[PDB]
Design an enzyme around this catalytic site. Sequence first.
Site, PDB file in Angstrom:
ATOM      1  N   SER A  49      26.361 -54.678  32.061  1.00  0.00           N
ATOM      2  CA  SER A  49      25.090 -54.774  32.776  1.00  0.00           C
ATOM      3  C   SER A  49      24.966 -56.109  33.529  1.00  0.00           C
ATOM      4  O   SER A  49      24.087 -56.242  34.366  1.00  0.00           O
ATOM      5  CB  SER A  49      23.949 -54.471  31.866  1.00  0.00           C
ATOM      6  OG  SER A  49      23.872 -53.050  31.606  1.00  0.00           O
ATOM      7  N   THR A 188      22.292 -60.311  30.139  1.00  0.00           N
ATOM      8  CA  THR A 188      23.188 -59.830  29.091  1.00  0.00           C
ATOM      9  C   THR A 188      24.009 -58.642  29.561  1.00  0.00           C
ATOM     10  O   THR A 188      23.711 -58.025  30.577  1.00  0.00           O
ATOM     11  CB  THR A 188      22.393 -59.381  27.871  1.00  0.00           C
ATOM     12  OG1 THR A 188      21.581 -58.302  28.329  1.00  0.00           O
ATOM     13  CG2 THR A 188      21.544 -60.496  27.300  1.00  0.00           C
ATOM     14  N   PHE A 190      26.751 -55.289  27.627  1.00  0.00           N
ATOM     15  CA  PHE A 190      27.307 -54.668  26.436  1.00  0.00           C
ATOM     16  C   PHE A 190      27.957 -53.348  26.847  1.00  0.00           C
ATOM     17  O   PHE A 190      27.301 -52.488  27.416  1.00  0.00           O
ATOM     18  CB  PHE A 190      26.210 -54.444  25.397  1.00  0.00           C
ATOM     19  CG  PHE A 190      26.637 -53.721  24.147  1.00  0.00           C
ATOM     20  CD1 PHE A 190      27.775 -54.101  23.454  1.00  0.00           C
ATOM     21  CD2 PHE A 190      25.864 -52.688  23.630  1.00  0.00           C
ATOM     22  CE1 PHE A 190      28.146 -53.452  22.282  1.00  0.00           C
ATOM     23  CE2 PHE A 190      26.233 -52.045  22.455  1.00  0.00           C
ATOM     24  CZ  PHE A 190      27.374 -52.431  21.784  1.00  0.00           C
TER      25      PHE A 190
END
Lengths: 247, 248
Positions: A49, A188, A190
């Site tokens: 992301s 962030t 993931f």
Amino acid sequence: HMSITENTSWNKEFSAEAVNGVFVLCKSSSKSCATNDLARASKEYLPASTFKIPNAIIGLETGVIKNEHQVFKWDGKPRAMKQWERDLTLRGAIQVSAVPVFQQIAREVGEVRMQKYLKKFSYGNQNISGGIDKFWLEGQLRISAVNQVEFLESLYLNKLSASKENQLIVKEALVTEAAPEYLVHSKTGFSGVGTESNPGVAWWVGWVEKETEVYFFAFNMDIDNESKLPLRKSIPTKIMESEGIIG
Amino acid sequence: GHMSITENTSWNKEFSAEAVNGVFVLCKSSSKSCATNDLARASKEYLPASTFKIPNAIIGLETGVIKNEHQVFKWDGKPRAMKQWERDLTLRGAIQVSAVPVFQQIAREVGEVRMQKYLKKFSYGNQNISGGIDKFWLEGQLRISAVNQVEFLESLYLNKLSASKENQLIVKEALVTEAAPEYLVHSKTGFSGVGTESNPGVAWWVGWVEKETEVYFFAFNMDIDNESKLPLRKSIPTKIMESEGIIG
């Protein structure tokens, strides 16, 4: 023109958590950087992301995103997360990592324009295979922590090949912490957990402004277990604290 | 303008609880849906004090007096009136700590002609820059109402002031004061001083709040003759905004 020094003492915070990862931290510019692991600092991984930073810029540049005030309306059909089932601003979608919003942005941008912009931004291996709406999530695109810092520094300075106004728009969307002489812009990522030793990757990238100084950072880690995901903030925070930047 | 505003005197509870004479103006979406505790005071003009750093920063950038958003305003090492100002500051830092002397030098360099021009273009209060170029907003003749502040901020929010969009964006990031994933506050305080006999000073808090896909514009002022009452300039509006469900 990066100048980077290996500092193996930073490995303590990874080893204390049985984690394999890298932190790159630069003061003022990419001419003054440190890392726990030179080799991994230059190793390219799935952006996940963290790719919403370039994707938002390219959206604005292409006119896919109409302006800073656009609302991405939820059509009502279920989504992988509760958090995403609602109307969102540009900043909201970034902050909650609303993948489906950015998939639709990517589709409308299209291969040709996406490819051209990743070349202009020197963004990783400028691959984009997989599909147009998945290349940063499960496709062939890869970028190093070093390359993330260089891209973030260009954005910080308005030096990307994009209008200064579009860069400023994406910058306010990245603000994650604010105080009178202390401001964080961060994102962030993931990819998912991973098949024993085919682990996923987690990221935290951004910059910290404190008094008249600026620090650029990028962190990644191998992750095979969703419970370890908060380490992507605690490990960098701890390093940045021992360096007196914060805490 | 085209403001639509409703008096809601239930809001007076937070003022009278603290023995404060003041006004709160709160608008949902636009200036076509506003509410206040006191319609008369909502339109009454007061010295902007440090709330004048928002237009001054834009004008600084527009005129090239501030070269860009990364400029550092260096302290010469001589006494300044507050310790918090005795340091090098960024543009954001100087706004956030209300570093008057930084903005005084900016104003002198902007100068009277350009300053007057931009206040007209912004429809900023009574547009009166009498009193000296480096102190008209602190002790001179400039005056602005809570209503006009909300209209100015709305224009800033929308990037519709007569200024480059990039300059407006720069000053907006300098004003961010609280950030969460779906909740963001841009704001500025001011305080003119404690005034004189029968002639109180003024304190302000102005800004906007973005929550989910909504935006709320706000302007608060109060009469103040005692510096210990200064925290009410945030606590009163915050409670009003809490009771409307906006925050906290």
